[PDB]
Design a protein around this nucleic acid. Structure first.
Lengths: 101, 142, 45, 150, 109, 37, 117
RNA sequence: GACCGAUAGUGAACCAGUACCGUGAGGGAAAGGUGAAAAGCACCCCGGAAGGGGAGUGAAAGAGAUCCUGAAACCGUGUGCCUACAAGUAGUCAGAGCCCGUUAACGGGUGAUGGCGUGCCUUUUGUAGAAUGAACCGGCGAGUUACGAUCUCGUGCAAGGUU
RNA sequence: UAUCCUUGGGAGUCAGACUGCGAGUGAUAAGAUCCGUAGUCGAAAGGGAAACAGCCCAGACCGCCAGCUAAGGUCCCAAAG
RNA sequence: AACAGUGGUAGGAGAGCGUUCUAAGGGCUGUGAAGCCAGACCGGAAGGACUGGUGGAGCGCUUAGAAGUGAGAAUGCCGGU
RNA sequence: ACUCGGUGAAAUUAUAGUACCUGUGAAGAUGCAGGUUACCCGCGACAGGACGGAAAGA
């Protein structure tokens, strides 16, 4: 299991599990690859300076979606200030493949 | 994905000997143990602490002149009904309550804090009846 | 002596919890099968 | 109005204060604040604008091939059946406008009952009945009259 | 299962529910005795409705009078009559004469 | 110009400003007249 | 012409009353109080979507402190050592997982110890 | 009739200047809808009756006489989850357990515990206040029109334009 | 560095409050007394000062269970010696 | 595309959502219209669909036009509770 | 008055799961901060608070 950094954030992944990333472009069916692997734990552990040199985690794209809607509502008492807005944050569903080379 | 703990909590029993120790310096560490701050699986709402037995409660130490000028008050409910007694009387006659008052005051307020306090046992003397729980010996860090 | 505020439903229902009736004390008449209050009369029973 | 509703003079209240009128606009009784009022909606355009508009509509209908120029439209008998046969002969299946020179009566009586046909004379044509009706039937004399008027 | 309803009965619903709570769930034969021996003014009315329900169960659905139990029993609100001037003797105003709908259902256990 | 495809000349018609119909339009409570003035 | 209007009012109030589902007593029944509660909930939700990011970091720091003191260090010394070794890229969140699920992360504490000398 | 459609439109769609109020001059309401057709429930059963349950008529009887549709407040019956050591503008974020299974969606219901959190409106330099208003629900309830003045935009024609 | 001039249309506003500097003022230290002069609130949420319109840091388009700091802090409540 | 920006009361400016009616084109609907009830759907907001129940005869889409044009506060008025 | 059977109103009412103390605060804190107490639900009394009404100085 490695520790990737994708969306200005880090995740811990093991082969076969499904993860949700930030948009991450790409298209359903494509095979994405991550370069910044910061730690490869397991039997042999490879703590790496900045990033473990020569470490890549492949993965497969399943869908590009948007999460459940959030209704952002704010107001100020006594001042007649209202503001309503909707938000659905895009994501990407990805399945982890071979967590080395 | 962070692991919150529930029904997986496993507690231990520790014995702390309060012979040559200061009231506040011991109570802080004991309350931290009771709240579970020393465990990697600590979660803020499920009380992951463990049990603490304190012996030799009558040997606690107070620096300065606290043994004469530290007063313990209590107001029952009646208006103006405020009674008091000095720390010398408290340590000579009610040591256990004196330790409990400090440790309770260092604990969070609410239901979880009261449960955490329920996890504490204080005994004057040198013997405790909890040999069936096979407790260990814990040394204060500082 | 003026109600400062209206009473909520839950408090009304809570106050009305002791305002209920009791099952009577009834025995069956030796002759017949009529039911009467205990220690009451029913030869016609 | 709040003053044209029956009653309302006295201040409704008394005692054993007195404020308002049972006919104020916020009462169930009556009193409408502004509401509609009888007025005319008509106005006028410059004459050159009217001439340009009618000419534009006529030319537009010319472009779409929705114009049929008939030598003459005469009816020996004033029968609705004969107008229906004539209209079918020219392949006019929808709303149509017929323009005659000086309002002959046999054509006016026929096609009066046909649900999509309107008959006018040369000096009666205007923007609405030209735009509205899909097709335009006009006699050669009415063409001359319209051309010489404009 | 059999049902019997009494509509617009001249009784306040809150006072009828006191007895309705007593009798619901009981065996149908025992319930009649409780109604006969309770000293309330809703008992006679509820007893009439219960007897009517038992009758329908035998004459219309051919179920036996034994092996019968009270399944549902509730009281609803009926149209209210408003007496605006109890000025007669009373110094009150707009008295409300309330009303009830009494329903009883029985079935075989 | 068909009667179901009428288009005004661009810029000849402006929508009237209706005052006093909510705080989201900017002309709500005080109706554009502000406070006492 | 005249315009009556009842349907728009009913629908607009029903939306709010449906959003107020689950509140206590009158606050899921009457429109006037349900509206106030829904507005308050919107404000609270914004504020707490910020406070959540505030709070999970606090939890992570607490767990790291505990697991580090299980090794002879404190949180501050361990973080300084980790940053001084470039391995600090590793987060606090990921560190905390590797504290409840693999205390063999002590490897990282050993690296920080080596760099702190 | 780019007029209303039963709180509207006449005060009055209904035995309305009626009922009511006042000594009198005078003031002045509320109240429309079975069904295509009464075919408007023979007969049986409980009940003094009222009212029901069958049977029957009917497309419909949950269309049975204030009988089209029938919302909300308000009042009840049953049940899934929680609740008798707990201090609260009642939610919000984190969160086990239990119960479900959807417009399949990083699902629905309830929530033991932890953090944060002094209603809405008006007004004021400033409000959580011992400033003000609202018992709750529903309906109705406020920047128009005419004639002048002026400015911008559009269209037509232009030293001319218009009745 | 990107503002400022003219013309035209539309306005709102006319009891402001507190804090710090001065040393104009009892020119001195003032307090006064106003005078200036700057800031904040009004119209500004967020962190700190236990709580706190006007003090300190700092100006919220919206999401994230990412990182670095400001004022202020690191025995326990309560994050960190 | 590359930068820069997006707190806000009085107030100024801009873009839109819904309601009734009218005109033109297109349609729905007794194999079930409007209205009412429920739902875990869609849009940046005002809002809009789709399924199921009830209902038992009318309604909506596109482009224009006209307004008795949108309610939580008036010790509002009327009704119900 | 109280218990039982019958009948049955009014002023008031933003919603409300509505402790106490010491502070803070635009008037006086239940609802702000810190602490201390408190199993759930009633019936009868008191008059302390009642931001109840009377009052009235002024």
């Amino acid at each position: 299991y490695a520790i990737i950094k994708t969306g200005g954030k880090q995740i811990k992944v093991e082969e076969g599990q499904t993860v949700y990333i930030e948009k991450l472009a790409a298209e359903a069916g494509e095979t994405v690859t991550f370069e910044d692997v910061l730690f490869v734990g397991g039997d042999n552990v490879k703590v790496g300076n900045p990033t473990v040199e020569g470490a890549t985690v492949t993965a497969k794209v399943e869908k590009q979606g948007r999460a459940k809607k959030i209704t952002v509502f704010r107001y100020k008492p006594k001042k007649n200030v209202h503001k309503k807005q909707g938000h659905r944050q895009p994501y990407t569903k990805v399945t982890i493949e071979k967590i080395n080379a | 994905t962070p692991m919150a703990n529930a029904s997986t909590i496993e507690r231990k029993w520790l014995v702390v000997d309060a012979a040559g120790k200061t009231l506040g310096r011991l109570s802080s560490e004991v309350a931290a143990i009771l709240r579970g701050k020393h465990k990697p699986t600590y979660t803020p709402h499920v009380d992951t602490g463990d049990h603490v037995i304190i012996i030799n409660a009558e040997k606690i130490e107070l620096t300065g002149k606290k043994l004469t000028d530290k007063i313990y008050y209590r107001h029952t409910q009646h208006p103006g009904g405020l009674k008091s007694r000095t720390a010398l009387e408290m340590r000579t006659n009610y040591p256990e309550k004196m330790l409990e008052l400090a440790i309770k005051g260092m604990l969070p307020k609410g239901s979880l804090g009261r449960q955490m306090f329920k996890k504490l046992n204080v005994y004057r003397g040198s013997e405790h009846p909890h040999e069936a729980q096979k407790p260990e010996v814990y040394e204060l860090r500082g | 002596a003026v109600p400062f505020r209206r009473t909520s439903k839950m408090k009304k229902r809570l106050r009305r919890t002791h305002f209920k009736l009791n099952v009577p004390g009834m025995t069956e008449c030796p002759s017949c099968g009529e039911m009467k209050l205990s220690h009451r009369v029913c030869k016609a029973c | 109005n709040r003053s044209e509703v029956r009653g309302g003079g006295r201040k409704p209240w008394r005692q054993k204060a007195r404020q308002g009128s049972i006919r104020s606009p916020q009462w169930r009784g009556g009193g409408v604040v502004f509401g509609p009022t009888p007025r005319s909606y008509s106005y006028k355009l410059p004459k050159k604008v009217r001439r340009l508009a009618i000419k534009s509509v006529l030319s537009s209908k010319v472009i779409d091939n929705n114009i049929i120029v008939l030598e003459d439209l005469t009816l020996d008998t004033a029968k609705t059946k004969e107008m229906a046969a004539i209209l079918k002969g020219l392949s006019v299946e929808k709303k149509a406008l017929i323009v005659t020179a000086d309002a002959n009566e046999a054509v006016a009586l026929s096609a009066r009952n046909i649900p999509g046909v309107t008959v006018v004379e040369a000096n009666g044509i205007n923007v609405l009945d030209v735009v509205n009706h899909e097709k335009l039937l006009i006699t050669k004399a009415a063409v001359e009259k319209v051309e010489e008027v404009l | 299962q059999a049902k019997a309803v009494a509509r617009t009965v001249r009784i306040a619903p809150r006072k009828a529910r006191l007895v309705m709570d007593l009798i619901r769930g009981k065996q149908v034969g025992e319930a009649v005795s409780i109604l006969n021996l309770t000293p309330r003014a809703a008992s006679p009315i509820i007893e009439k409705v219960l007897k009517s329900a038992i009758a329908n169960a035998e004459h219309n659905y051919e179920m036996d009078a034994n092996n019968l139990v009270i399944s549902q029993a509730f009281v609803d609100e009926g149209p209210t009559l408003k007496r605006f001037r109890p000025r007669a003797m009373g110094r009150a105003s707009q008295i409300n004469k309330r009303t009830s709908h009494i329903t009883i259902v029985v079935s075989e256990k | 110009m068909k009667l179901h495809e009428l288009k005004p000349s661009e810029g000849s018609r402006k929508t009237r400003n209706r005052v006093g119909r909510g705080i989201g339009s900017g002309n709500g409570k005080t109706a554009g007249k502000g406070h006492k003035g | 012409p005249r315009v009556k209007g009842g349907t728009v009012t009913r629908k607009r109030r029903k939306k709010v009353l449906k959003l107020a589902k689950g509140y206590f007593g009158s606050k899921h029944t009457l429109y006037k109080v349900a509206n106030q509660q829904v507005m308050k909930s919107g404000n609270y939700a914004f504020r707490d979507r910020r406070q959540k990011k505030r709070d999970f970091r606090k939890l992570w720091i607490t767990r790291i402190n505990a697991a580090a003191r299980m090794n002879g260090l404190s949180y501050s010394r361990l973080m300084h050592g980790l940053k001084l070794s470039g391995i600090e890229v590793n987060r606090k969140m990921l560190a905390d997982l590797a504290v409840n699920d693999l205390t063999a992360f002590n490897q990282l504490a050993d690296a920080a110890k080596a760099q702190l000398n």
